[PDB]
């Protein structure tokens, strides 16, 4: 499967994943809103944002 893996609002980049869902994860630290993108569908802490999707390049 093919997922975005670029951080926050850096330039779009993608990656091949042996998983079937992609993820977009977002939280607040002293920098502001931070976004992580990758392969899979991880558990996150309460309050943290997580979008897992079944398509390709869905985690924009």
């Amino acid at each position, epitope marked *: 499967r093919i997922c975005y893996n670029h951080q926050s609002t850096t330039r779009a980049t993608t990656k091949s994943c042996e998983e079937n869902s992609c993820y977009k994860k977002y*939280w*607040r*630290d*002293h*920098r*502001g809103t*931070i976004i992580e993108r990758g392969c899979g569908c991880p558990k996150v*802490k*309460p*309050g*943290v944002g997580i979008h897992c999707c079944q398509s390709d390049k869905c985690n924009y």
Partner: antibody
Amino acid sequence: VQLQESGGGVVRPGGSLRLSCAASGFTFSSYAMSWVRQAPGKGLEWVSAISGSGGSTYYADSVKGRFTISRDSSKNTLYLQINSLRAEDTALYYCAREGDYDSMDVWGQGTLVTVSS
Amino acid sequence: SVVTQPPSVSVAPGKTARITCGGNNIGSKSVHWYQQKPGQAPVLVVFDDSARPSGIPERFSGSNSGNTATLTISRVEAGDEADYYCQVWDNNSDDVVFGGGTKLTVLG
């Protein structure tokens, strides 16, 4: 990647000091930066942090309204302005580069502030 | 949130050291661990509960659930003697909370 603090020394209670931290080997403005202090023989105490742009600042309750954090991207330098100094501000002052979840992945060697009349 | 570390832990070389960081619902927060040797700056050894920065030995492992986060140092060595600090991140507040530190003695 390096951080180097300066500006510490002996200062009177009710006095003022400006601490500086010179950063190198990374894109300075992409990272939040923190000041953390440590009294001799005591634990780490977070003092203040600042977003990449300087648009957000954050302070410990103990220092609200006496300390000001600022940065200058052109000089790759972080500052801490410490006013109305108290005995309890005596500490080694570290600057740190933050990462994910305010983890502090790079530290300087610290600058010593001694508050005495 | 007050976070509680034991002031000291002693372990024989080769044994496993466990340093705890206690706080109500710390399991819902993210915990980092620092190593500080005397006259040195802190070094990040675990971040986000269980991740290891590159160059940190595999003997250093973290966990976090419920009211307890733990730094576990397996096969402890004389060179691991240090003060250890936990740091708690919470998505819903700004303040940086550190535990009071734990002195790890490696018993020689």
